């Protein structure tokens, strides 16, 4: 394995990851904004053979006055043939460390209700469910708008 900063040229080689229905494919403005504003929150893993196992992309925001200064996880995906290796745990730990270095307060992320495996693995990681939001996922193709779970975890500053 090899962890490095995400770059624009990698956008032409990560197609073997987004083909999973559970993963999205945002537009050019989204990726450009996330890369320019928060370059340090964009990590990609490269295999010895030249493939990409997965990537983690996030951001930080909030108000320090109300202790809302927190890190947020936007996307996190792993290739189907590179799972069961703890890569997601390593990426999450790296994001937690980099958010702690910035003096945050907590970390949060959204998740699909039906995605049972992700919820179980997050719960195993010490993450505690915060609340539930109704019809967050704007489903297309006639599918019902699935709700989302607001997932949260504390930090060490508090």
């Amino acid at each position: 394995t090899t962890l490095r900063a995400f770059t624009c040229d990698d956008l032409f080689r990560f197609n073997n990851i987004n083909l999973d229905p559970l993963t999205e494919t945002y537009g050019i403005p989204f990726y450009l904004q996330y890369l320019a504003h928060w370059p340090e929150y964009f990590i990609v893993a490269e295999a010895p053979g030249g493939e990409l196992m997965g990537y983690i992309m996030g951001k930080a925001e909030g108000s320090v006055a109300r202790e809302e200064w927190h890190g947020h996880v936007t996307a996190l995906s792993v290739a189907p043939e590179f799972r069961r290796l703890g890569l997601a745990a390593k990426l999450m730990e790296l994001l937690e460390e980099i958010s702690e270095r910035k003096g945050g307060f907590f970390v949060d992320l959204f998740v699909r209700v039906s995605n049972q495996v992700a919820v179980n693995m997050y719960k195993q990681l010490g993450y505690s469910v915060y609340r539930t939001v109704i019809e967050y996922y704007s489903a297309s193709n006639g599918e019902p708008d699935e709700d989302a779970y607001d997932m949260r975890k504390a930090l060490s500053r508090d």
Binding site: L22, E24, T25, Y26, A75, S138
Partner: peptide
């Protein structure tokens, strides 16, 4: 994951 927007 978030919504596409």
């Amino acid at each position: 994951m978030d919504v596409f927007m």
